[PDB]
């Protein structure tokens, strides 16, 4: 009986492989061959943000494209004014071990998560004029790896317990749990429409999740090692993943397969973060070799490089209006590029 | 060029900078320790004088030590180990009494020692339950020489307790010495289930670690 189920599982995987192979007729590289290259992309560091006295793990741009929050090993959450370099708030954290931060789209909340296995939500705008913990979300048996607000009252998280969750912040309990991953879930990206999201895990697979149904619609597997980073194309019909296999791969939701891989023999370091430009033509990836590479997403030719960090780039963020790119690093500085 | 409200915001940012600098100065005093015992090691019990991630603080010679144990995570620790790449030292606890899992302890120690993130961090190895090891080897009902060929013929560098203890110590010390980099050192200590002085030995090894870092920064060694 067990062998029958194993055989069914194997044959269904083989059928899926054959179907995806049938859908493939021409490659994205072949189709984009007769298109003009982007050319050399030269970006300089317009601003450098100082005040974190330890390693930086996470950054997230606010929706106004001017405020950003960063999390560091020093145990502080700091909100920056990117235009003037001013510090708006400095939030002391109960646990110094942080691995992700998030900024609510409204701007009234930020979220922080780490090895304490709790996603903490902070009320930025409140009478008495100080930041306070509005809600501590307990229920995960592993470290919080990523969190992203959907609304003021909804946040989705990934964790080291190989599971993602959807929370109702006011109630404080999980309303949906997403259970298909074998390894720890490292990264998470919401779709622009918010109905769906993607996550990459240590099993070297990416999964597409229905926020309402609570099911895994699709699974993608091209990477040889763990996926540290994941980003959704601005269209919402594609996403890119980053791994310590040192490749970056682009996957399509509708075609259900990889479209291109962004690799070079010169680069052997792992990808810590990935992000897209507003058009999606540029795919920026942070690496463990202390540099970030600019990739031509449509031709998979490396257009440029951002090289200003003394230590590894932890986090990447392209601002909503597309003007600037933020990069946090283990050297304890965030740099804004343009 | 700068408005009144922008000037006030700049003053606020300067006050925040001052508070951050004061907090960092306060934090720099403490020395940070990572505790990693696989199982049945007495790692919660080794430092008993002072009492998702657990923390304990103890002070010896007016020096603050903060020790981290991560019980929340699953058995494999690979991903979150990059966080503790700045600690003064790691404290590895091993139960020398259990011979069957002793090779598992060796594999765990080798994995921690050869980690890319922890290349520059020393390890203070505590071999726990030496009294249980002594009782077992003195009884002689179970012998490591039977399972392990190496103890059957071993020259020491009771006497049977000595041979067993130095062989077990050499098992870890060989792994530590195999790299030969010299940037980080293993400090092995044989400890019983109850020991009055363990924080003293941690303090001495941390002092030596800081001394070696000083000698390396000064170009002397």
């Amino acid at each position: 009986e067990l062998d029958q189920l194993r055989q069914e599982a194997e044959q269904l995987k083989n059928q899926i492989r054959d179907a995806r192979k049938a859908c493939a007729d021409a490659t994205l590289s072949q189709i984009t061959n007769n298109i003009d290259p982007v050319g050399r992309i030269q970006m300089r560091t317009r601003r450098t943000l100082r005040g974190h006295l330890a390693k930086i793990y996470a950054m997230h741009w606010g929706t106004d494209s001017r405020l950003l929050v960063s999390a560091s090993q020093d145990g502080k959450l700091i909100i920056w004014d990117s235009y003037t370099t001013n510090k708006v708030h400095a939030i002391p954290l109960r646990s110094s071990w942080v691995m992700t931060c998030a900024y609510a789209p409204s701007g009234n909340y930020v979220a922080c998560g780490g090895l304490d296995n709790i996603c903490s939500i902070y009320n930025l705008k409140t009478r008495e004029g100080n930041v306070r913990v509005s809600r501590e979300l307990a229920g995960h048996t592993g470290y919080l790896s990523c969190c992203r607000f959907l609304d003021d009252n909804q946040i989705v998280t990934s964790s080291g317990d190989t599971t993602c969750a959807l929370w109702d912040i006011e109630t404080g309990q999980q309303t949906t749990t997403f259970t298909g991953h074998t390894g720890d879930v490292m990264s998470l990206s919401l779709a622009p429409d918010t109905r769906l999201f993607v996550s990459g895990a240590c099993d070297a697979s990416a999964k597409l999740w229905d926020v309402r149904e609570g099911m895994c619609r699709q699974t993608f597997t091209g990477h040889e090692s763990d996926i540290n980073a994941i980003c959704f194309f601005p269209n919402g019909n594609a996403f890119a993943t980053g791994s310590d296999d040192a490749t970056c791969r682009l996957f399509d939701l509708r075609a259900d397969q990889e479209l291109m891989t962004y690799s070079h023999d010169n680069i052997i370091c792992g990808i810590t973060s990935v992000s897209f430009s507003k058009s999606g033509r540029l795919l920026l990836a942070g690496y463990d070799d202390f540099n970030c590479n600019v990739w031509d997403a449509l031709k998979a030719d490396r257009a440029g490089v951002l090289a200003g960090h003394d230590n590894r780039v932890s986090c990447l963020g392209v601002t909503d209006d597309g003007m600037a790119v933020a990069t946090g690093s283990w050297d304890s500085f965030l740099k804004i590029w343009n | 060029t700068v408005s009144a409200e922008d000037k006030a915001a700049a003053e606020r940012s300067k006050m925040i900078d001052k508070n951050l600098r004061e907090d960092g100065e306060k934090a720099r005093r403490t020395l940070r320790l990572l505790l990693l015992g696989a199982d049945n090691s007495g790692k919660s019990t080794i430092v008993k004088q002072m009492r998702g991630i657990f923390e304990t603080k103890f002070q010896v010679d007016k020096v603050n030590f903060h020790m981290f144990d991560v019980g929340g995570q699953r058995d494999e620790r690979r991903k979150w180990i990059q966080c503790f790449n700045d600690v003064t030292a790691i404290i590895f606890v091993v139960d020398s009494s259990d011979y069957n899992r002793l090779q598992e302890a060796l594999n765990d120690f080798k994995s921690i020692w050869n980690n890319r993130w922890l290349r520059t961090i020393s390890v203070i190895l505590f071999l726990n339950k030496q009294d249980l090891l002594a009782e077992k080897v003195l009884a002689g009902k179970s012998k490591i020489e039977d399972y392990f060929p190496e103890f059957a013929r071993y020259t020491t560098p009771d006497p049977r307790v000595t041979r067993a203890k130095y062989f077990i110590r050499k098992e870890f010390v060989d792994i530590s010495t195999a790299s030969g980099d010299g940037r980080h050192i293993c400090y092995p200590h044989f400890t019983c289930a109850v020991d009055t002085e363990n924080a003293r030995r941690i303090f001495n090894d941390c002092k030596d670690i800081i001394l070696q870092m000083n000698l390396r920064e000064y170009n002397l060694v």
Epitope: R66, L67, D81, T84, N86, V88, H89, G107, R127, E128, G129, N130 | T1, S3, A4, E5, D6, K7, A8, A9, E11, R12, K14, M15
Partner: single-chain antibody, 228 residues
């Protein structure tokens, strides 16, 4: 959140008196503090003390005679006055303010204490006839442009209902203050600002003041009153 002012009363001319404003229910250290109203006049800004006391400004009228201070552990704010003149008589108000990106200065005011002993901001109408349920527009004008290169126009609106201290409605010409209904709306251009109240109700009656925070000294309009 609460500010209570103590000290005041009759003082002979040339005397000295100290006012005290005690803060309760908010992080007093993080807020910068500031205002007086003569017995039948509009608002006049007196002094400012920054958070941490790094900055102090005074009105030129009171400079050399008024000293402003704060006791952060006790959360108290004070104003030591000397050489008191008959023109000093007023009701002195204690006002909290905080300055970061997106903040709302002058949001809370105290009840005030009564003592008895430059950009020109223009409010043409001293009074405006109004009936309930009808939209009304109140205008203010500035000698120079309150528009700044950063893109902010530092204009504020306050409402002082009868028998009450002022209350912030609009900050930076367009941003509605917290706890204020959507009826109030602020629109304007550089040097020309209007406050439109739509679907007017009772308890909207009072004196509407326009204030600029572009540069110190902070200056007020004369104030336009709404009377049913």
């Amino acid at each position: 959140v609460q500010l209570v002012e103590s000290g005041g009363g009759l003082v002979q001319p040339g005397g000295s008196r100290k006012l005290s404003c005690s803060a309760s229910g908010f992080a007093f250290s993080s807020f910068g503090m500031h205002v007086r109203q003569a017995p039948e006049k509009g608002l006049e800004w007196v002094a400012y003390i920054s958070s941490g006391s790094g900055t102090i400004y005074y009105a030129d009228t009171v400079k050399g005679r008024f000293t402003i201070s704060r006791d952060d552990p006790k959360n108290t704010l004070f104003l030591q006055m000397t050489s008191l003149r008959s023109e000093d008589t007023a009701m002195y108000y204690c006002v909290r303010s905080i300055y970061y990106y997106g903040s709302s200065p002058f949001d809370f005011w105290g009840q005030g204490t009564t003592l008895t002993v430059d950009i020109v901001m223009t409010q043409a109408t001293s009074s405006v006839p109004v009936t309930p349920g009808e939209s009304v527009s109140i205008s203010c004008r500035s000698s120079k442009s309150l528009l700044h290169s950063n893109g902010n126009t530092y204009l504020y609106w306050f409402l002082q209902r009868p028998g009450q201290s002022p209350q912030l409605l609009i900050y930076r010409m367009s941003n509605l203050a917290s706890g204020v209904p959507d009826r109030f709306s602020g629109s304007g251009s550089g040097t020309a600002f209007t406050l439109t109240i739509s679907r007017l109700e009772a308890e909207d009656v009072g004196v509407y003041y326009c204030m600029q925070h572009l540069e110190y000294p902070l200056t007020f309009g004369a104030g336009t009153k709404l009377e049913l």
